[PDB]
Amino acid sequence: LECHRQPELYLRPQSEITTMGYQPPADYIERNLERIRKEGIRPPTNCSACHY
Amino acid sequence: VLVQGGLTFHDITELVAQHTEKKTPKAWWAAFSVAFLGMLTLVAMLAYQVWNGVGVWGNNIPVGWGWPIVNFVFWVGIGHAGTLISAILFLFRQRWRTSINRAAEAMTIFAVICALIFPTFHVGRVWAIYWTLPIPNQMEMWPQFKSPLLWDVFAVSSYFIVSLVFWYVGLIPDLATLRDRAALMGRRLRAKILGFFALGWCGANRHWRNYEKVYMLLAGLATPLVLSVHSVVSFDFAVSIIPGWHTTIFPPYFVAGAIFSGFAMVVTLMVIARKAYGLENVITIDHLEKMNIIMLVTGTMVGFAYITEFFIAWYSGVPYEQYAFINRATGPYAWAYWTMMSCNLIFPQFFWIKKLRRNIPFMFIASIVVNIGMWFERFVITITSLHRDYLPSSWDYFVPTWVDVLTLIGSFGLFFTLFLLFLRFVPMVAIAEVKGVLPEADPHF
Amino acid sequence: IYGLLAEFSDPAALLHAARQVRKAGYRHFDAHSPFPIHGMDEAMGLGNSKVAFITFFTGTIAGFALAWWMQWWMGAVDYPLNISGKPFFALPPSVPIIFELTILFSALAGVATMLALNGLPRPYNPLFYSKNFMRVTDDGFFLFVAASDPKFDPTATRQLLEQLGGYNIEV
Amino acid sequence: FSRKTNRLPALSLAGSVFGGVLAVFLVWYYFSPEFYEVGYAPPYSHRIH
Amino acid sequence: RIWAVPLAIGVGLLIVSLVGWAIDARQFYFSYLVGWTFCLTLALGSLFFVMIQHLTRAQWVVAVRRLPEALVWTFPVLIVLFIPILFGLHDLYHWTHHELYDPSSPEYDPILAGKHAYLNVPFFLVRIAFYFFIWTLLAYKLYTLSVRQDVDPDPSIPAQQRKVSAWGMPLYGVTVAFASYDFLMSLDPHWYSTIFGVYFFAGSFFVALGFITTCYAILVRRGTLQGIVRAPHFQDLGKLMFGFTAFWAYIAFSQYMLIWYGNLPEETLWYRHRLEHGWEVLSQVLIWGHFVLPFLILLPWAAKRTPVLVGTMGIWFAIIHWIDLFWVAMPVLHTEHMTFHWLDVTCWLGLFGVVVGLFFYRISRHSLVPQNDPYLARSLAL
Amino acid sequence: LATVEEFRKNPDFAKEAEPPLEGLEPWDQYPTLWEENHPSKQPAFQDSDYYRNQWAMVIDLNACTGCNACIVACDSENNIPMVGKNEVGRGREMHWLRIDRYFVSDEAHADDPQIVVQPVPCMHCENAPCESVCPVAATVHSPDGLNE
Ligand code: HEC
Ligand code: HEC
Ligand code: SF4
Ligand code: SF4
């Protein structure tokens, strides 16, 4: 749940997501929130998501 | 005068010592047999339960609860009696409670033990109840504080504590007395070393004044809690949308039920703690006389609410709440409510005849019958409007199983089992304040 | 020299007798009897009241703040829930916890003081093994002096000589 | 009775204080009972693939 | 005189408030209710103080016993002050209109087979005129007695007062419940609450404890006495004002959390009272000013027993019942416009003066402290 | 029940049995005590990939007669166990969708039954008393009217 409350510390740009030797860029966070503003992901916080 | 005894300050110590001096009772050996057998029947059916599943109790889904939580309100409503005659009677300072007080928070604390087991056990998933507590748990989860089933937990997990700590503090002079006797006359030299619960007692000025204001504090600080504990355990009902519950008079009412239940058991204990192992000179019969008023207060305050219930059905009820109480009188449980209300009303309005009926043997045969309506009061109020509530589809009688009854019985078992246990160890009477209040402790001589 | 003892069987003397000596002479840090000799602190015990209600100050506030912080931290900001449209720790269903849970954590501090006034857990008590203080509850209602600046000398034994004592131990 | 139970509030206090210290600096509740290197039927060895 | 100044200024003001019954008509009838019932709660509260003083008998607060007893014979005078309701009674309760059960109106309010037996305005006559045969009968059987054990002392001095408490006791608590269920339950009869019969009771015996208390606190300073009634007398009155502030706020909050939760149709007392129209202001500044300032200020026993404070509280402790009861009586009219009028207050300071006019004139008529009594010096020499 | 004659007369009759109050709002979307701190006005209920589409489930009861297949697909889709005679006798059944029937005669005039059938799932409320009351937060108004 730490990601569904604090996601933008983690999420990848989807370009070559499966890259174990991935250091993210600098200005990572602000480069990410512009996607949550656009992509509109809106992670779940509720009981309905996974527990049913 | 409010105690009839040809006593001085010393006469109690030799006597209550003789009640805790040597270990060779025989009636004990019968009570600890039948009562522990009652406790054995309890756990014999209470782990039979959890390995198997809830439905061995007689609970349908509309009436999800049945006798267990009914007994929780009983075995906590029974217990408020003990703590409030410790608190209230100091607030009004009637200087009268002293003959019985220290035996009463026992009669509360053990009731709270055999009470608290029910919320831990009428659930189906007992093991997953620590989630109910507000521990920062293995995830970012915490309980829901809009739930009176949770208020019950904090209340009882505070009421077991405050009533204890107010009883334990209540009985410090005993341990002082017994620690003082264990050296010179008593069981062993190693009862003194057991009596470190004295906590360096000497009866000094510097802290005895503090003891008074603390006893004042907990009196004025456990009564606001008592009026919240049983009120919580009433809030769980009346907060609901059910018509037979949502009526708002219930929290004062069930409290009066706790009065009219608790003293209705204390008298059962005092009668049998007056015949064989009794204190004629300290448990004056005039005490039980002035005791049954505050019972008979709630012998009518409980009655006034039944009128309001039975009234509001005629005044401005929902067309369901109109039916909700016609059910109570006329329907399956006519055996209960007609006789229950009549039982809880006849006998109190048949009680005050010969100056409150000081006669001791009537007390036992009445104090039972006053209480049996209480187990019905909470089997009626809870359940009689929990079926026949807002649908005919949810119409179902409640058939109680043969395991419902052995848990009820077992609650008497563990109550007597553990009430007797510490009672034989601690002193019964509040001997500290008895010889300090009514006798010549007054400096006017 | 740790102090004295005074076998007073009179229930009433401890008001009028001991009030003489807090005035005439020394302070008398410690008077001994089971029950409250009534109207003592009127003049005797040197007290306007209990002091530790001011120490009950921190009992109510922390418990009050605990529950009220157990919900401003819990009901809205960290893992909230639309349980029944309940508006996120609105006062009323919090009252029987912002009231009652306060009582527990505020009472125990009310008694942690009680266990702290001269530190009641001192079973070491070099007067208590006095061979006749062991009938404390019944024999008499005793007096005592630590070795204050007006030190326990024969004058104190002479002082309580006329304050009628069944005997005078000198620990 | 006994003369040096002035030390007794210490073991009462401290050992009770250590009750909290041993409680919270010991939990590791979903970090100790999670991690393991199970023995497969064949070893895949993600290293190599 | 001491007796005519609250009376001449209050009846000077009441006769001025005839302007209300004449001008801004429907306003004054219900400013009269909030005043009239306050005087009744004053009668109701301080009488129950006398009762409980006898049941679990208390020889410790007996210097504060004779004066409640004076307060009771108000309620016979409160009879002839029932009149202004009756001309406006057809305008108030909304079931007296009798164009609603099954006449030609569009409304068939479900009152026909449910309530019409309990409420029919000639029945309302007897449902209160019956109470005048009880709550006054207590006066003519208690006040006639307790004033009379002084000059003509009896062989059985208290036990006749107990006889009132043996069978005249429970009927009181009943008639208080049905009274509240007949007066103040009925302004918004789209409401069903069982507790409210006690909120009127407790909210009375809450208050009148203060008025009895502040009276001595006024009559101790530049009164006929100054030191007879010692401090620890009031120390109990504090212990009562807390033990009954609890029995109020327990009730005023059990009326709230229970109805704050369910949100039922009966809630419409408070979708109109509490939130809307300048009354969320009232309830907040009420409860902060009604429970916690008393429960906080009076608490510590280093000034709890001082006379002039508890006297100062009897003002803030009884003037507030206006604010407590103006949250019940009037708002069903000013539900549109929370603009409390000058007539809302002339009857408060009026009847709170007129009742006190009679209250001193009877203490002028005869004694103040009972010239002989059981356990008097036991409470005076305390 | 209602007739085409009566239905022709008062289309607002589903409410007429328990209509809204003297001058207050229509019944659904009726305000509570709270409206400013209501969770739908707070973000944490409103912030997900769900609030877009509030879910609801009407029943054209005019064509609902006891086919009783409204149940069984619930039993298989959202799994259940069965129950025995020896068990259901005490009144428990793990069928979630009651399909309760009812009789309505003209005050028992000629004993004309004139039945009605109507399913009754958990109308996943908004005010939702059940949600409020689980102390162990096993219920919540999940987004989209779902009360999961
Ligand atoms: C980042 C570090 C994450 C972790 C760890 C987990 N989740 Fe996730 N989840 C994440 C994002 C960014 C999103 C939103 C994507 C969007 O565009 O909406 C989600 C979403 C979900 C959902 C969505 C609901 C659905 O489609 O059913 C679910 C059910 C979900 N996540 C589940 C889930 C679980 C069970 C996790 C750990 C056990 C978990 N997530 C971790 C990012 C991250
Ligand atoms: C993913 C999308 C989840 C969300 C959102 C919530 N929960 Fe969770 N929960 C999830 C997992 C994967 C686990 C397993 C952890 C483990 O112990 O292995 C849990 C755990 C729980 C539990 C404990 C169960 C146990 O066996 O110990 C509970 C009681 C629980 N979760 C409840 C819960 C609630 C009430 C939530 C919102 C209403 C919630 N969880 C969010 C996955 C996810
Ligand atoms: S009972 Fe259910 S499944 Fe059968 S017709 Fe009606 S809605 Fe359909
Ligand atoms: S309380 Fe829960 S299950 Fe019951 S009707 Fe409402 S939403 Fe449905």
Numbering used by the authors:
A (entry chain A): 160 to 211
B (entry chain C): 18 to 462
C (entry chain D): 23 to 193
D (entry chain A): 5 to 53
E (entry chain F): 35 to 416
F (entry chain B): 744 to 891
Quote the passages of the study that discuss this structure, keeping the authors' original sentences.
In R. marinus, ACIII is composed of seven subunits encoded by the Act gene cluster, six of which are conserved across species (ActA to ActF). ACIII is composed by a combination of proteins present in other respiratory complexes, which reinforces the modularity concept of energy transducing machines. Our structure shows that ACIII meets all requirements for an energy-transducing machine that couples quinol oxidation to translocation of protons across the membrane.
In this work, we describe a 3.9 Å cryo-EM structure of ACIII from R. marinus. ACIII is an L-shaped complex of ~130 Å by ~110 Å with a membrane domain and two peripheral domains facing opposite sides of the membrane. The structure shows that ACIII subunits are organized into two functional modules: (i) the electron transfer module, composed of subunits ActA, ActB, ActE, ActH, and one unidentified subunit and (ii) a module for membrane attachment, quinol-binding and ion translocation, comprising membrane subunits ActC, ActD, and ActF. Subunits ActA, ActB, and ActE in the large peripheral domain accommodate all the prosthetic groups in the complex, for a total of six hemes and four iron–sulfur clusters. The putative quinol-binding site is located at the periplasmic side of the membrane, in the first four-helix bundle of ActC, at a distance of 10–12 Å from cluster FeS1 in ActB. The location of the quinol pocket also agrees with the quinol-binding site of the homologous PsrC, identified by co-crystallization experiments, with a C-alpha RMSD at the periplasmic side of the first four-helix bundle of 1.446 Å. Analysis of the ITC data revealed an ideal fitting by a 1:1 binding model and a binding constant (log Ka) of 6.5 ± 0.14, supporting our observation of a single quinol-binding site in ACIII. The observation of two likely proton pathways suggests the existence of two proton-pumping sites in ACIII.
